[PDB]
Ligand binder design. Structure first.
Ligand SMILES: *c1ccc([N+](=O)[O-])cc1C(=O)Nc1ccccc1
Ligand SMILES: *c1ccc([N+](=O)[O-])cc1C(=O)Nc1ccccc1
Lengths: 245, 262
């Protein structure tokens, strides 16, 4: 039992490092304390930030779309490193990714957030929570719930080795709509759940019931995703450019 | 064997189970006995259509609205039972009163649908303390938007029931649900987290002892909390539609208060 589980944890960690350029460890060192990020706290600061790194709200949402598309490819590469994933039915792999990416994106974005803002462009920039909140509707309320979630998620003080297994657990969710063969997805998630539990007990022996607390955060996470999707529909309100997004 | 710290967790499990039985008059054990025909004395009358619905009241609105009103007022009575159970959870009544109200406000419906699953199979749901059984098909046939009210609960129930939890398991699970430190507007999160920590420990051990062959049942149970939240979020929205389309339909103030700015 045990050998399999520590091999799985190390493997996922190594893959996670390969696939995700800006890890939580690198990000936390930026948000605490040789180069600080360029801080975007203003309309004017945003203007200069573009010179360094139609209107303001729309241009930021577009940058945000670009970043999303990058992140989905990172996540897809990672998913394919999870033992068993590529041997699943192809439709099912596509379904797991389709419904998993948003959960994964905002989980991992918490690594780049504190209560005051979020790192951008590989940690070269920092956009303040208040600046994003000041954007005119409906853009002003776009990131706020992700910040609220992140504050609660970051209080678990998970590190990259923990998160690598948790993200894999998220990917292997057997309740996604339209799955054809749920059994092996649950079988793999069971194994990943065992590996996460062990990892959190070995890595954080003093955090009582960290495993249970982490799993419970999915409830808030799925809430934020459903709100996000609804807002995206509301926002839908160069052809080749429209196609990519 | 058991050590002193795990012994205390067993005592807590037993206390919660005991309070659960005293608080909730129709248990999963009784519901399953009714449903699976351990019965000559316990057989329900089955409501599957208009004429059988009529006959059921022997043992004035329209059909869809009358059922919904009955469903409403049973909800209220269930909130009462959950509130009396909550008081039994050690530490709960010692919390800030405002936090007691917040925890109930956000937790009571997640508990309602957890326990409703006990009274459901794929074909319908037990009603009136298990004396009746209303079919899923009949409910789904009610006019819009009432016909889609209960379907999400059935879909959740069938998956939840595959975990094969018993009342002793459920008693600790519903306590964990109530003592969530991540509910919005809580004043003092720490004391709540400390209670849940202990409850989570007691649930883990309970599932290990009661279901030793069921791998990661604890994790799989905790994952179902997300389904519950999604039910409650959706259910609320459907209520707002119903209110607006039926200006003559009354919502009980307890329920209206619970959903207010949720
Ligand atoms: C920004 C705008 C729109 C979407 N969307 O269409 O879903 C997503 C985002 C977003 O959050 N992208 C992102 C991903 C990862 C890190 C930062 C930003
Ligand atoms: C039925 C109709 C309306 C509401 N509501 O307004 O919230 C709720 C319900 C309902 O779920 N009733 C119920 C819950 C649990 C067990 C039996 C009946």
């Amino acid at each position: 039992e045990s050998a399999d589980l520590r091999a799985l944890a190390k493997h996922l960690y190594d893959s996670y490092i390969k696939s995700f350029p800006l890890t939580k460890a690198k990000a936390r060192a930026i948000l605490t304390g040789d180069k600080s990020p360029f801080v975007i706290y203003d309309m004017n600061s945003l203007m200069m930030g573009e010179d360094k790194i139609k209107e303001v709200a729309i241009r930021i949402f577009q940058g945000c779309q670009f970043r999303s598309v990058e992140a989905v490819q990172e996540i897809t590469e990672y998913a394919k490193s999870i033992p068993g994933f590529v041997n699943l039915d192809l439709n099912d792999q596509v379904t797991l990714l389709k419904y998993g990416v948003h959960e994964i994106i905002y989980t991992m974005l918490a690594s780049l957030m504190n209560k005051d803002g979020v790192l951008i462009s590989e940690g070269q920039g920092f956009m303040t929570r208040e600046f994003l909140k000041s954007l005119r509707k409906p853009f002003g309320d776009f990131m706020e719930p992700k910040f609220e979630f992140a504050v609660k998620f970051n209080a678990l003080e998970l590190d990259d080795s923990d998160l690598a297994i948790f993200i894999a657990v998220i990917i292997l969710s057997g309740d996604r709509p339209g799955l054809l063969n749920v059994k092996p997805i649950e079988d793999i998630q069971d194994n990943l759940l065992q590996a996460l539990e062990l990892q959190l007990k070995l890595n954080h022996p003093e955090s009582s019931q960290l495993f249970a607390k982490l799993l419970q955060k999915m409830t808030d996470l799925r809430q934020i995703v459903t709100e996000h999707v609804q807002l995206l529909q509301v926002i839908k309100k160069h052809p080749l450019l429209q196609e990519i997004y």
